[PDB]
Enzyme design. Structure first.
Site, mmCIF file in Angstrom:
data_model
loop_
_atom_site.group_PDB
_atom_site.id
_atom_site.type_symbol
_atom_site.label_atom_id
_atom_site.label_comp_id
_atom_site.label_asym_id
_atom_site.label_seq_id
_atom_site.Cartn_x
_atom_site.Cartn_y
_atom_site.Cartn_z
ATOM 1 N N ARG A 174 23.891 22.491 65.236
ATOM 2 C CA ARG A 174 23.462 21.534 64.223
ATOM 3 C C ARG A 174 24.060 20.153 64.468
ATOM 4 O O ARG A 174 24.762 19.931 65.460
ATOM 5 C CB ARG A 174 23.812 22.025 62.817
ATOM 6 N N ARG A 226 16.640 13.626 62.233
ATOM 7 C CA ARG A 226 17.675 13.243 61.284
ATOM 8 C C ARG A 226 18.056 11.771 61.355
ATOM 9 O O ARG A 226 18.981 11.354 60.650
ATOM 10 C CB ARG A 226 18.923 14.106 61.500
ATOM 11 C CG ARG A 226 18.692 15.591 61.290
ATOM 12 C CD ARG A 226 19.662 16.416 62.117
ATOM 13 N NE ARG A 226 20.994 15.827 62.143
ATOM 14 C CZ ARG A 226 21.919 16.028 61.214
ATOM 15 N NH1 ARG A 226 21.691 16.806 60.169
ATOM 16 N NH2 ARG A 226 23.102 15.434 61.338
ATOM 17 N N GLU A 262 13.423 14.655 53.032
ATOM 18 C CA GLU A 262 14.630 14.940 52.255
ATOM 19 C C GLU A 262 15.361 13.633 51.969
ATOM 20 O O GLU A 262 16.428 13.366 52.533
ATOM 21 C CB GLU A 262 15.539 15.921 52.995
ATOM 22 C CG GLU A 262 14.815 17.108 53.607
ATOM 23 C CD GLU A 262 15.737 18.002 54.411
ATOM 24 O OE1 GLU A 262 16.844 17.548 54.769
ATOM 25 O OE2 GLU A 262 15.354 19.157 54.687
ATOM 26 N N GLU A 269 13.083 18.965 62.965
ATOM 27 C CA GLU A 269 13.675 18.024 62.024
ATOM 28 C C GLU A 269 14.263 16.843 62.783
ATOM 29 O O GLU A 269 15.056 17.029 63.710
ATOM 30 C CB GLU A 269 14.751 18.700 61.174
ATOM 31 C CG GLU A 269 15.408 17.770 60.169
ATOM 32 C CD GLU A 269 16.567 18.420 59.441
ATOM 33 O OE1 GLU A 269 17.468 18.957 60.117
ATOM 34 O OE2 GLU A 269 16.577 18.390 58.193
ATOM 35 N N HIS A 329 15.787 12.783 56.376
ATOM 36 C CA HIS A 329 15.378 13.700 57.436
ATOM 37 C C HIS A 329 13.940 14.168 57.241
ATOM 38 O O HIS A 329 13.540 14.565 56.145
ATOM 39 C CB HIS A 329 16.311 14.914 57.472
ATOM 40 C CG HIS A 329 17.765 14.564 57.541
ATOM 41 N ND1 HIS A 329 18.221 13.346 57.998
ATOM 42 C CD2 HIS A 329 18.868 15.279 57.213
ATOM 43 C CE1 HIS A 329 19.541 13.325 57.948
ATOM 44 N NE2 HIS A 329 19.958 14.485 57.475
ATOM 45 N N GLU A 367 17.631 10.695 50.214
ATOM 46 C CA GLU A 367 18.887 10.607 49.483
ATOM 47 C C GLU A 367 19.028 9.211 48.894
ATOM 48 O O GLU A 367 18.691 8.218 49.546
ATOM 49 C CB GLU A 367 20.084 10.917 50.386
ATOM 50 C CG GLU A 367 20.131 12.347 50.891
ATOM 51 C CD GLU A 367 20.822 12.468 52.234
ATOM 52 O OE1 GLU A 367 21.783 11.709 52.480
ATOM 53 O OE2 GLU A 367 20.408 13.323 53.045
ATOM 54 N N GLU A 390 24.863 15.159 47.004
ATOM 55 C CA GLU A 390 25.295 14.916 48.369
ATOM 56 C C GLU A 390 26.812 14.756 48.423
ATOM 57 O O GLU A 390 27.491 14.643 47.399
ATOM 58 C CB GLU A 390 24.594 13.685 48.941
ATOM 59 C CG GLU A 390 24.378 13.733 50.448
ATOM 60 C CD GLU A 390 23.446 14.850 50.871
ATOM 61 O OE1 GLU A 390 22.588 15.252 50.059
ATOM 62 O OE2 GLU A 390 23.568 15.325 52.020
ATOM 63 N N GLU A 436 20.252 14.178 46.434
ATOM 64 C CA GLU A 436 19.160 14.465 47.349
ATOM 65 C C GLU A 436 18.136 15.353 46.659
ATOM 66 O O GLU A 436 18.497 16.321 45.982
ATOM 67 C CB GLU A 436 19.668 15.148 48.622
ATOM 68 C CG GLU A 436 18.571 15.569 49.583
ATOM 69 C CD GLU A 436 19.114 16.230 50.834
ATOM 70 O OE1 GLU A 436 20.038 15.665 51.454
ATOM 71 O OE2 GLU A 436 18.616 17.316 51.197
ATOM 72 N N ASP A 472 -5.216 -11.556 47.259
ATOM 73 C CA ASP A 472 -4.673 -12.404 48.317
ATOM 74 C C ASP A 472 -4.124 -11.511 49.420
ATOM 75 O O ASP A 472 -3.065 -10.898 49.275
ATOM 76 C CB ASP A 472 -3.598 -13.329 47.759
ATOM 77 C CG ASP A 472 -3.156 -14.378 48.759
ATOM 78 O OD1 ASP A 472 -3.691 -14.395 49.886
ATOM 79 O OD2 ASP A 472 -2.278 -15.195 48.413
HETATM 80 MG MG LIG Z 1 18.037 17.411 57.074
HETATM 81 MG MG LIG Z 2 21.269 15.882 53.153
#
Ligand SMILES: [Mg+2]
Ligand SMILES: [Mg+2]
Ligand SMILES: [Mg+2]
Ligand SMILES: [Mg+2]
Lengths: 443, 443
Positions: A315, A334, A131, A332, A244, A133, A188, A195, A52
């Site tokens: 960062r 986030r 990554e 990356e 991330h 979590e 974490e 993680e 279906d």
């Molecule tokens: Mg990260």
């Molecule tokens: Mg982390």
């Protein structure tokens, strides 16, 4: 061609599987499957299985339509937690219309189309390392989740220790036995939050790994009397869950984001990709954060990206460039959360980044001034902008942006818009205990 | 070079480990780790593992920074309580900046720097033998600690007897099987309090042994349905927990604290070390006792050192010299508690003692008059002084003393003070049930 039909038949014969799950993913990201005996393995390989087709449309299904379930041979995986009464195997299946054409509403087919656009543009592959979590909650007497966590750990803490339990260690061991590549796992900062990091493979294989990881984490937790949750913000005052994406672009020569002669050891392709990601971030924030609870995680702070900026030193930006270079050069993002659909997420991301390359956009200058404290005038002076604060504003941004619509396709776009609008309307008209507890006595 | 890369690979192959804990210690002393599969053992040995470096900074982390996790081969240990689904191994890892330089905030690197200063001064090694004490509490129905102890034992009593349980005996047996050197174990004067003594090894190995001992005790106590606590004063009116350090200094000839021709069979180096320890004891009392509850143990009595004096006959001083001589000559510091960070503790201790040798300070005359009963004028007449009575005064003494700052380094110093002042401010503004129970009716 990692596997062939004869190889699949031989595997089914020699590990003696008796149950096969032809699994796929809908728009909402829920893992769905049809379950067949091993005697029907031939019919599955012959691409003659009906199902279906309105199921993948979600709860907004109206008209039933039968459609094929073309499987993928490279995703043959046998689960070990099957006891002795026959093994269980799964195969990721593409959705095809009865006229031998891929369905427009299949997220996997949309991702394949976007990857085809990338390849015809000149690139080879779009590597991703996620990554994710997740949270673990103690079950109640009736096998129902509670609000209590399994342990009061900390960031990178050795909280679950050893001597049985330790669901994270068992999950990692089962994933390694099953044939997945795991980089590292840790605890974490929130209690009961873990993680697990993955290696870098192709985008489609990244989606398959993410979905299998979700399934395996849920199954093992349930077996150990726990509940695994990927909802971004399970509790108030507790850090949210993120997924991330560490993504890199490859060409015939190699990594397209690496250049020793460029600034920050970055190629002009990397800067164009960064500009494309930053320009359309408000556009695809809805796709990357598809739930109402997701935007509760995107609050101003020191770990939640609610600004539009890129950096490699301070960062905690929206987009962070890890210090590693060479073949490991990557960008990356986030702002992604585990509740998002990986297929749609990288579909819209690849489109945005590639549009930035096509247009040769110049990214804004990076900010390393810890953008949490500067005044609103200071933020406005720089090209710093805030992500949408609610699902409705993100949906409006989606309806405004056109490139993200092309990256999502038509059918997926309208279905996502309809489902998200219905969900937002349901949330809006509901009455929450917060309103009662803070107005029932006062008024 | 006790072990090499090939040896580590062979061990992982032949005891078939599948889980590896790359563990380290932050400023607060909490054991932290990153967990990797055995397939990533090569990357760990190649010193290419990234991790969030702000984790070691504790809860005062602001800016995320990626940094390396250089491991140590001599600390390869395989845990036995791993069932059959793969073994678990741990390796103590140094913290390194991305530019191939050790991190200034790593306690282990700071201890290594202090040991390098010692070696370039002329000594060879700084042997330590610790005597930690821990409490065992019965868990509740929900696996939560209670206020009841496992047995009502006494000092050196044969309280846990035999026939199963006896968590101390099992802990000692597991530690011996694992490859640790244990001198003796006994029951402390408080009920449910046990002490395990270690042999005399190098300072870094002493820290590793202490951390592994804490981890093993916690794991074994949990497996037997108990809770292991290293908080110095779990209960009021009950004796606290201590971690007396038996430390000796070695040179090329041998023990530097032994001299048959000297007074008390002690060399002038030993007296200089004693003077250095006594002069700066108020300075590093904060480092040796970093918790608020630690100073509740340092109350005037017959077993808690709250004075600044040394003796070898009356016992119970701040610093006690055991009667044993020769290669076993040592100075015992009794003000350390198990909650302290061993790395920082011996870093500040070695610095203070070595400064006493450099300055050739003459220690004050020993007191054997049982210093608990003499009047305040009598204590003031002698060079007897009291240790700081609260964390805040100890933090002030740290901020005043400069040699201890050099021994701790910069980054560790500012981070320690910051976190400790936050802990002190949190304690100060809290309202305790003591105040309610003794003022709610009266006022
Ligand atoms: Mg990260
Ligand atoms: Mg982390
Ligand atoms: Mg003792
Ligand atoms: Mg002692």
């Amino acid at each position: 061609a990692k596997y062939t039909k004869e190889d699949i038949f031989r595997f089914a014969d020699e590990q003696n599987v008796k149950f096969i799950r032809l699994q796929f993913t809908d728009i909402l990201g829920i893992i769905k499957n049809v379950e067949i005996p091993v005697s029907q393995l031939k019919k599955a390989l012959d691409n003659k299985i009906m199902f279906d087709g309105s199921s993948i449309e979600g709860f907004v299904r109206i008209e039933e339509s039968d459609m094929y379930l073309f499987p993928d041979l490279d995703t043959w995986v046998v689960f070990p937690w099957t006891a002795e009464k026959g093994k269980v195997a799964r195969m990721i299946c593409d959705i095809y219309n009865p006229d031998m054409t891929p369905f427009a509403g299949d997220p996997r087919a949309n991702l394949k189309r976007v990857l085809k656009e990338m390849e015809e543009l000149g690139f080879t592959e779009f590597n991703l390392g996620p990554e994710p979590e997740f949270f673990l909650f103690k079950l109640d007497e009736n096998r129902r989740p509670t609000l209590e966590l399994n342990d009061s750990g900390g960031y990178f803490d050795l909280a679950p220790t050893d001597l049985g339990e330790n669901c994270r260690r068992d999950i990692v061991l089962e994933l390694e036995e099953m044939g997945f590549e795991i980089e590292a796992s840790h605890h974490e900062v929130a209690p009961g939050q873990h993680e697990i990091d993955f290696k870098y493979e192709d985008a489609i294989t990244a989606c398959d790994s993410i979905q299998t990881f979700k399934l395996v984490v849920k199954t093992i937790a349930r077996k150990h009397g726990l509940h695994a949750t990927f909802m971004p913000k399970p509790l108030f005052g507790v850090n949210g869950s993120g997924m991330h994406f560490n993504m890199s672009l490859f060409n015939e020569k190699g990594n397209a984001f690496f250049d020793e002669s460029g600034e920050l050891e970055l190629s002009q392709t990397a800067y164009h990709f960064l500009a494309g990601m930053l320009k359309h971030a408000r556009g695809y924030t809805a796709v990357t954060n598809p739930t109402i609870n997701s935007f509760k995680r995107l609050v101003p702070g020191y770990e939640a990206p609610c600004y539009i900026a890129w950096s490699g030193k301070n960062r905690s930006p929206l987009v962070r460039v890890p210090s590693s270079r060479g073949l490991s050069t990557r960008l990356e993002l986030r702002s992604v959360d585990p509740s998002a659909n990986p297929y749609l997420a990288m579909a819209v991301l690849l489109k945005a980044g590639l549009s930035g390359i096509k247009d040769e956009l110049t990214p804004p200058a990076p900010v390393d001034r810890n953008i949490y404290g500067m005044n609103e005038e200071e933020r406005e002076a720089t090209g710093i902008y805030d992500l949408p604060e609610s699902l409705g504003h993100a949906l409006i941004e989606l309806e405004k942006n056109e490139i993200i619509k092309d990256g999502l396709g038509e059918h997926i776009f309208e279905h996502f818009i309809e489902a998200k609008t219905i969900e937002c309307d349901m949330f809006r008209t509901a009455v929450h205990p917060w309103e009662r507890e803070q107005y029932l006595e006062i008024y």
